[PDB]
Amino acid sequence: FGSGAIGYEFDNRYLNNQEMSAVAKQRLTSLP
């Protein structure tokens, strides 16, 4: 059969968690 109303949102949530992990390592450094 076929339906993506639950897999699409889980994939989107997985990629959102990856998004937050990626942007949580961003730092504007100091001590130049």
Binding site: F1, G2, S3, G4, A5, E9, N12, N16, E19
Partner: protein, 225 residues
């Protein structure tokens, strides 16, 4: 694009061309309108992003003065409210009530809870506030008795049901578009291929499923009839 183009794209992807088809275009409209809100929430709820102009719709409302509760003296000040029930906005876009001119006026659309307590600031005693009550109407509130003369407003937002807000669509220059199929569907093109894919996946499996086809006072689905 219009409702007709999206509907018939879905139908032709599914090849539901015969009039003797189980899944009519009404199923397509229902699925499209729900999956639109689904996709918009999935894309514009995680983190704040630019929302294009295609996702929005303008409804036009006619306001009427109503008592707060009833006609009593001590029941509080009166409110204006839209004559008809208003669609529910999603919390992802830029909702705005404007006085028939988007580039002028300040009518603030706020939450139901906030509007309980607004205007106590002396400099904010002349600002009209809006919210959708649990009644389903858009209620207006302010401390400046001039607001009660307001007769017409237009509300621009990413409404949660495209069908409802399109039915409440504002009159065009040519005139009103009677048929919903000839109105414009509220979604950006970059979200249209995913929307069609989701709806077509939703109805592909059910399209070829068996039916309880024999009229024999019996359930015939276990036998794949």
């Amino acid at each position: 694009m219009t409702y007709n183009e999206l509907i018939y794209m879905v139908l032709d992807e599914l090849k539901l061309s015969s009039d003797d088809s189980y899944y009519t275009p009404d199923h397509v409209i229902f699925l499209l309108v729900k999956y639109r809100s689904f996709l918009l929430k999935q894309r514009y709820s995680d983190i704040k992003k630019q929302i294009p102009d295609s996702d929005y719709q303008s409804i036009c409302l006619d306001l009427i003065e109503v008592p707060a509760i009833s006609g009593e003296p001590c029941e509080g000040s009166s409110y204006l409210r839209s004559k008809n029930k208003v669609p529910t906005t999603m919390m992802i876009g830029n909702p705005r009530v404007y006085p028939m001119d988007f580039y002028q006026g300040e009518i603030t659309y706020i939450s139901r809870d906030r509007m309980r307590y607004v205007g106590y600031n002396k400099f904010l005693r002349n600002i009209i506030y809006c919210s959708k009550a649990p009644d389903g109407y858009l209620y207006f509130k302010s401390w400046n008795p001039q607001f009660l003369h307001l007769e017409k407003v237009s509300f621009n937002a990413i409404f949660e049901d495209a069908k409802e807000a399109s039915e409440m669509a504002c009159p065009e220059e040519n005139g009103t578009i009677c048929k919903l199929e000839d109105k414009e569907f509220p979604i950006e093109d970059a979200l249209v291929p995913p929307l069609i894919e989701l709806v077509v996946k939703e109805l592909r499996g059910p399209e070829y499923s068996p039916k309880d086809e024999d009229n024999n006072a019996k359930d015939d689905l276990p036998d794949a009839r």
